[PDB]
Amino acid sequence: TEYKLVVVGAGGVGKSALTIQLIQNHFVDEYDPTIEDSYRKQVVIDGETCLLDILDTAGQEEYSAMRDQYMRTGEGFLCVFAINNTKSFEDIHHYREQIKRVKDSEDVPMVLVGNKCDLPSRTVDTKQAQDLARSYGIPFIETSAKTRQGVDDAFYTLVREIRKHKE
Numbered sequence: 001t002e003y004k005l006v007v008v009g010a011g012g013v014g015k016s017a018l019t020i021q022l023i024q025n026h027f028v029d030e031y032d033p034t035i036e037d038s039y040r041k042q043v044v045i046d047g048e049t050c051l052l053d054i055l056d057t058a059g060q061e062e063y064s065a066m067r068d069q070y071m072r073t074g075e076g077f078l079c080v081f082a083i084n085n086t087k088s089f090e091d092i093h094h095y096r097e098q099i100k101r102v103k104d105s106e107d108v109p110m111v112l113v114g115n116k117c118d119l120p121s122r123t124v125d126t127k128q129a130q131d132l133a134r135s136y137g138i139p140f141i142e143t144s145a146k147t148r149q150g151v152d153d154a155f156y157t158l159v160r161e162i163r164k165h166k167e
């Protein structure tokens, strides 16, 4: 089965770098922040094959209805912030609200991702992010697209969350 995964978060948090590690096994140092693209990858998770369709978002669309549409078709959401950027963490509150609002749903599969854990000047404590995820009933995973810490776990965990919702 094909699953639609959507990677959301503020500009610069590492959405593209996380996605390209999973898809292409390398860490990109410069990927235009304004490009939005999708990637397909066949995988096996918990013994069951599936086709991932991963949308690496980049923010505003020509029409806001198009952003609403990809949230409606999206089955699970990787909500990414950067651990050195408090505003990107605060934005998670808005992503949670907006995705639920567009889907008109109280139960939306999501994983909270705190990326850039290899960088200095952390401003978001592990506990603060874990507590937020727990308040939503979703997993929290610390990642680094540079070292590949957590990357594969984040995406595979999101598929598990999608299946738990559908099952």
Ligand SMILES: Nc1nc2c(ncn2[C@@H]2O[C@H](COP(=O)(O)OP(=O)(O)O)[C@@H](O)[C@H]2O)c(=O)[nH]1
Binding pocket: 009, 010, 011, 012, 013, 014, 015, 016, 017, 018, 028, 029, 030, 031, 032, 033, 115, 116, 117, 118, 119, 143, 144, 145, 146, 147
């Ligand atoms: N050190 C480090 N750099 C990262 C990490 N993730 C992304 N970057 C870099 O941070 C910048 C923004 O990443 P990008 O994936 O383009 O962010 P996006 O705007 O969310 O798609 C780029 O220079 C990436 O190489 C990370 O986990 N660690």
Ligand SMILES: [Mg+2]
Binding pocket: 015, 016, 017, 031, 032, 033, 034, 035, 056, 057, 058
């Ligand atoms: Mg990007």
